[PDB]
Amino acid sequence: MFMINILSLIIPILLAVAFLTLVERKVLGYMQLRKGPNVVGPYGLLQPIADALKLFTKEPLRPATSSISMFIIAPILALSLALTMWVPLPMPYPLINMNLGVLFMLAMSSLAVYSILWSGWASNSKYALIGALRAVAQTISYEVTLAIILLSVLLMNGSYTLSTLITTQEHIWMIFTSWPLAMMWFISTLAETNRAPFDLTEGESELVSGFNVEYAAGPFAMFFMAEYANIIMMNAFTAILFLGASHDPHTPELYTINFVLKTLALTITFLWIRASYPRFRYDQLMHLLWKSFLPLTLALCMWHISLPIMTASIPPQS
Amino acid sequence: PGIVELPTLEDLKVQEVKVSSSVLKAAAHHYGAQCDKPNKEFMLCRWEEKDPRRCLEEGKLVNQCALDFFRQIKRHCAEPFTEYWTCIDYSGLQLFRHCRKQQAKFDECVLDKL
Amino acid sequence: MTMYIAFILSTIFVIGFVGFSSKPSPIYGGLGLIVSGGVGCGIVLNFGGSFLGLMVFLIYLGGMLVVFGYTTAMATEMYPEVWVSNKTVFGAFVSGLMMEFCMVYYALKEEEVEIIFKFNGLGDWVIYDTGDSGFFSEEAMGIAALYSYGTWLVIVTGWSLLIGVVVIMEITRGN
Amino acid sequence: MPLVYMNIIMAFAIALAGLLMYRSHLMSSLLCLEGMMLSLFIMSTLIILNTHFTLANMMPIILLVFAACEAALGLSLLVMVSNTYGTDYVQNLNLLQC
Amino acid sequence: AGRIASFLKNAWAKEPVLVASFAIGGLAIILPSLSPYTNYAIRINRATPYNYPVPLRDDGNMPDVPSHPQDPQGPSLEWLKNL
Amino acid sequence: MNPIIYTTLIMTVMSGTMLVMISSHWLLIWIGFEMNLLAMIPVLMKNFNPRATEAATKYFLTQATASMMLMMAIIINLLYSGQWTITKMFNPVAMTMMTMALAMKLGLSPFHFWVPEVTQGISLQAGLLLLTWQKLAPLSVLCQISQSINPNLMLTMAMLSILIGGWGGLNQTQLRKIMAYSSIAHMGWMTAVLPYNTTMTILNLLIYITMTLAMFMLLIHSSATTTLSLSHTWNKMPVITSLMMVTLLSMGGLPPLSGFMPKWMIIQEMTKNESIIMPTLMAMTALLNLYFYMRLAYSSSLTMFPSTNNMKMKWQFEHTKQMKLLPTMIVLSTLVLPMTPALSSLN
Amino acid sequence: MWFEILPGIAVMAACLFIPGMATAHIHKFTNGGKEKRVAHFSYQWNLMERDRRISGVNRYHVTKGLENID
Amino acid sequence: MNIMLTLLTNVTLASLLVLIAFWLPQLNAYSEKTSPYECGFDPMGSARLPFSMKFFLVAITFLLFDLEIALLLPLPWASQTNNLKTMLTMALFLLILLAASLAYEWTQKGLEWAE
Amino acid sequence: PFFDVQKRLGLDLDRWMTIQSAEQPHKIPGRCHAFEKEWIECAHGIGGIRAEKECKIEFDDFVECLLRQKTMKRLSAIKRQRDKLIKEGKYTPPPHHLGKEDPRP
């Protein structure tokens, strides 16, 4: 019966990712004065299915100069970790209830980079290596700031339990308390998910395909699914963190609908941003994160440590 | 280095308090108010003797006093109490915050009944 | 003996140690240390130390990312070595696996003394506490007492980290 | 001592042995240093959790901190050596004799 | 009086992020030492009963110690509900 | 390197040593060793010159390995007794691991290989610090845990250090390697008496430190790091070579000089514990140190080597920066034997 | 159209509804319909185990009220 | 136990997808097809050659800064202590020295990539 | 060597963390608080040499609490005899050791 719950979490996530791709194409098209997919199915509703069936019936290629074990392990690790990040999210009840769910997401997101690193290295081609090294620089840029931002925000929660965040925001959204932290958190999520204007690893105009340039068919499809599931997952995490829906224990579906609407709004904002800005330079991303976000984040961390003691606002939990 | 002294299975016999956790939490405040003397005697024994074998008789009186307390609640208003702990039991964290109307009904019963 | 979960995890920990102790290509060595860090996190979780296991796993993920980046620059070695690519690396890996299995067998069905003391097995579940109380996590309170009891520890750790920044900047200056 | 303690101690011994028996790359030895730190962290955490020594729960974290300072030190040196030889091989460190 | 003003103007014109971060950090350092509520927080952290209050043995000359929880002796939390 | 940065690194090295010296908790002693090493590495690299990089890398690898074994011994001791206080080390495997880690840190044989290389690869000021200040923390730890120390292992390493320092010094023309082998021999002398009397260990350490400071300052004054470079000093500053000869004779252990006091004081102690063969072998082995000191004295002061023409120009200039503690150090390293009983003030 | 984007968003929203509602329904179904008990600390776990012991059927969710006091 | 089942399920699903991707379609692998990609022309050197890191000092610095989040992560629990004045002094002390570390690296040109 | 500045100044830099019986947060006790307290009290002020011989009973009990070696040996000797007695078949363990017990609150 817990297996049924695992499947009821996994399969709908994959369906949402498949249709997220259709949504991105349609939103970008209408923002570019065109229509996007509207032939394959009514309103392009069958386009993701055609894409998936096409990618899983095409020839997967193993490069001659590549290391096979890492080459094959990396997409598996990417997709499995993308699916694993969803299990502690309370919607309003989590599949897995963790004391330190935030730390769990931090650690698994840190482990997810090695899929790109090992993929790029094991492809044994120059563009894949350049993409992998860009991933190294990107993680170095965003990780410290993202962790300190999370700590500063959760000083209002009293713990790292994700369900407590619902109780914390019972009367007001936490974005009214820490919008300067929310802005930097949103930009750091853009960097962490390798999304434009921070999509350095793929580097399409610049590096052709970046890290997965040598990937074809099903393995490439798995990388794509992992990336889009990560987009949805990070936006759901932000929605839980900063825009807390009210939860009625006798009618949890109201919370579920509200939370899903907020997650969709944030994902559509991601797609909106991709159609508006040019790409960063990756050293410029490092300098943005280390010379602007880091000092402000340190100062705001001190402020959010002092404020509950200043005003006698310390949250309950031990 | 010696045999460990243990009580017999008969000395460990007592009338059990077989109510559930939500039932205990619904009555916890009044129970702590009413059965305080035997409870504190047993806890003083437990923390002074540092040995469960030396405070069995006080634990038996703790059980007996809890039985008397629950006997008074069932005898005077079981209905109001039952609606209060049932509402408390539904919560996954067993929250006092979510059942304030039922709690009021139970408190106002026990204020004039007892 | 129950589910052998802790023993399996410790065995995988040792196997990962053997993997990076073989001294093959660092990219591979880094992977073995990541496997060991995750499995050690699992071991610590199986004992009530959630925070410590998660923290060590996060720290080693970051450190191994830096090591991967450094390997691509300064330890590249055009034909990088996997465990089966060279007789020395394979020999060391097989020696480690065989030595671990020999120690486990000698300590499992019989009760041998290796260096310090002996072991009969019994599963690690035997040595637990039975303590029943608490609205907090004892591990969390112990770690949090660093800011009230460990004032001296905070002072020396912070000074060492600042000096570490200065020191790394001095070493790589060159000239 | 249970089997887990001996597995952790064996991990430390394997790492120490790995450190001592040099191959060619300097980075391969820095990895064995990191492994020794990881084994110490796990061992001390297990001992501390088992005996319920609450205050000692902060010492592995401290143990982690000075693990980074030692790694960052080593990598720093690995840079300079490489900048001299274009290679991190320990064979090149033979200018000084006994 | 006049040098610091020009320096602040130049810093606000060129690096507003650094000015904002330094101001926020300075406020975070200074304000807790000037607040009346900082004591209250401590008192709140002292009122949270994590462990069991073990009773004392009544030696017969312990006036301020209560004999029952509802007796008027002992610490009061009335200041907390009105806060 | 900036002078302020150099000053703060020196203060961090000293602070790590003092943290080891004032701690009762094993973790703080370990932290003191780590803090000492962290600030010690950049001091060895102050002048870049890739030999310094090599010496710093070798020193770091040796000291990090020793630190890891030290931490493992601490954890084993904690496992077999829930104790963090530095005491008699309830477990013998932990005691062996701790003794080996401290022997690696000090450079006792057979963990002695790194000392000559690191000393040759660094400058003379760095060598002075490495051979004087760096010995305080490990010896202060060994004094504390001396009661639980296994005599057979400690004395084996002490005899090996004396033999190896004496044999290694015979083959050296470079002055820094000579100093390193002298340091190894004196460490062996220090650790031979440690299980019997820690006051004798402290006395030997103090006399060795003053003698080493005098020798290193005399080598800094005359910028000589080789035997042939030192052989030119008679023709520029004869007084420096005369004081160097007397200091070398004292380091040899010849009576009535200051160097003799520790050996005389150690042998006597070992005879009160019914140890006769050990002091006799140690005293006879110290003659190798005396031989390669006498050879240096022959090269620099007791005969005159040929000089160069450009030395004439050096006759017109004076040593600009003066070392204020050099005269006191020379007098303390030579003329102090009549005040031997004052050693009772060390216990 | 721009409202032709809406069908895909509706499909995605329907897909994203399922996990939370399914978890809530499965929690109710396996927990007696009275919500899944949360045990962040050992005291809550002790309460759950006591409930399982006194339930007479080895289920923590079955609740024994004042009908067990004779 | 539930988390172990979840991890096993996710990894099994991903591996099954890889297996279907590699065993369902028709493979016609030949030497030209499997050759490395560099925009139509054969690569000059190896992709296993040293690739310089220009941000090497930031990467070493990230190691120390990453360990400071480990020291700051227990802060939510430390706010529950009675010695709030001591606790707040230590928390601010650690963040001030962290900022001072960044200030030293920034002013001494440590955050600039090598050319 | 050891310069006891903590004792001289009464500063307590690291003595709060040396033993497990020393003022834990929230009064959480160590697993062996009584044993270490008894061993420490018995050996206080008599010196290391005397304590090793005269407080060996307390220290042995403390070590038994720490590692529980004798307890595991006794349990193993119990279960080996039980296994032998069941393999040839004349024990028949009671129903409350197989899962057929009536649990108490």
Ligand SMILES: CCCCCCCCCCCCCCCCCC(=O)OC[C@H](COP(=O)([O-])OCC(O)COP(=O)([O-])OC[C@@H](COC(=O)CCCCCCCCCCCCCCCCC)OC(=O)CCCCCCCCCCCCCCCCC)OC(=O)CCCCCCCCCCCCCCCCC
């Ligand atoms: C049993 C009883 C007996 C016990 C015996 C104990 C042991 C006895 C001695 C053992 C052996 C000692 C060996 C010393 C080796 C030193 C190496 C060396 O300096 O090079 C040689 C040096 C070579 O000179 P050179 O090459 O011609 O000069 C060129 C420059 O090097 C070119 O460099 P530059 O251009 O960069 O020049 C910069 C220069 C110029 O200087 C400046 O411009 C000054 C600038 C000021 C900057 C301010 C920065 C402040 C910010 C940093 C804060 C750091 C905080 C660290 C603490 C963190 C704590 C967590 O600075 C220096 O040259 C070095 C500065 C030295 C600073 C000393 C720091 C002391 C720290 C104390 C730590 C303990 C604190 C308590 C800890 C508690 C636990 C936590 O000349 C000598 O030193 C000759 C030997 C001197 C030895 C002295 C004799 C022994 C002591 C006798 C006095 C009485 C002692 C007993 C006292 C009893 C208690 C009252």
Ligand SMILES: CCCCCCCCCCCCCCCCC[C@@H](O)O[C@H](CO[C@H](O)CCCCCCCCCCCCCCC)COP(=O)(O)OCC[N+](C)(C)C
């Ligand atoms: C969505 C995620 C879950 C999916 C759930 C379903 C899981 C599906 C399983 C994944 C594999 C998909 C592969 C589908 C095609 C079959 C490929 C292979 O298995 O068949 C052949 C297997 O046959 C082999 O030749 C060996 C046959 C016999 C030798 C050993 C088998 C012994 C079994 C005994 C069989 C006798 C009767 C048994 C009755 C039960 C191999 O042929 P090959 O050309 O290489 O591969 C390319 C396949 N093409 C042609 C379709 C492109």
Ligand SMILES: CCCCCCCCCCCCCCCCC[C@@H](O)O[C@H](CO[C@H](O)CCCCCCCCCCCCCCC)COP(=O)(O)OCC[N+](C)(C)C
């Ligand atoms: C004599 C030395 C003076 C000159 C030499 C300086 C060298 C030493 C460096 C700094 C010395 C400070 C260390 C003093 C030990 C701290 C512990 C003691 O003082 O009490 C603490 C007082 O700490 C306070 O926060 C004030 C001291 C903090 C000082 C701020 C840090 C500045 C250090 C800067 C020098 C260090 C190296 C350089 C780094 C920049 C906390 O006590 P409290 O919490 O009541 O009760 C604890 C007992 N409980 C838990 C059972 C209830």
Ligand SMILES: CCCCCCCC/C=C\CCCCCCCC(=O)O[C@H](COC(=O)CCCCCCC/C=C/CCCCCCCC)COP(=O)(O)OCCN
């Ligand atoms: C009292 C509490 C203090 C601590 C709290 C602050 C927490 C963390 C904040 C600081 C984090 C680290 C800061 C790092 C400092 C950077 C130094 C630096 O390098 O500055 C130069 C620039 O110079 C500056 O330092 C900027 C101005 C000087 C500092 C900023 C202002 C200082 C304080 C201002 C606020 C004071 C309070 C506000 C008063 C309000 C008015 C009444 C950098 O620019 P470049 O990289 O060289 O640019 C090249 C491309 N063109």
